[PDB]
């Protein structure tokens, strides 16, 4: 699989993380990020993939060592960390045909895994349109404990 490489953007007050929902496939929310292009560097990808996504060029803000990294079914996806945006920033994708909706989300209040459906003796786990963001959700509570406390 190629690798993507994204961002997780935060408000000023920590408390807040910047979505992006698409379409079709991609129709629930997630963070912005996408497939790294031959011989592009990671921080470059980064910037590429959420400028073209949400407006925001978040190249003067990465920090090399600061990102979640997990690999999901042998694909490899990492978020730079981006704290500190202002909730006010005027967020707009460059191309409507991927990218239906931008949105501040409360962190506290985002989903950290799917639930069962243990209610009806069923296997597997209920849809959830945070899905895409859900994996991300843990290891950044703990990033940002470690970080700031
Ligand atoms: O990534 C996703 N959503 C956010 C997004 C939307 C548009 C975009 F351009 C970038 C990110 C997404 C949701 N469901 N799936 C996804 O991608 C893997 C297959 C299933």
């Known amino acids: 699989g190629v690798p993507t490489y994204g961002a997780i953007i935060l408000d000023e007050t920590l408390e807040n993380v910047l979505l992006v929902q698409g379409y079709l496939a991609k129709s629930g929310w997630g963070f912005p990020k996408g497939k790294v292009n031959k011989e592009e560097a990671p921080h470059d990808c980064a910037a590429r993939e959420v400028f073209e996504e949400t407006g925001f060029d978040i190249k003067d803000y990465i920090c ?3 990102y979640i990294e997990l690999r999901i079914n042998d694909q490899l996806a990492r978020l730079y960390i981006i704290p500190g945006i202002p ?42 349109k945070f899905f895409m963001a859900i994996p991300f959700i843990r290891p950044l509570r703990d990033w940002l404990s470690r970080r700031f406390g």
């Open 64 to 66: 090399k060592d600061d």
């Open 87 to 128: 909730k006010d920033t005027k967020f707009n994708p460059k191309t409507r045909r991927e990218i239906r909706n931008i949105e501040w989300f409360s962190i506290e209040k985002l989903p950290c895994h799917r639930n069962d459906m243990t209610p009806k003796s069923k296997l597997g786990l209920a849809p959830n």
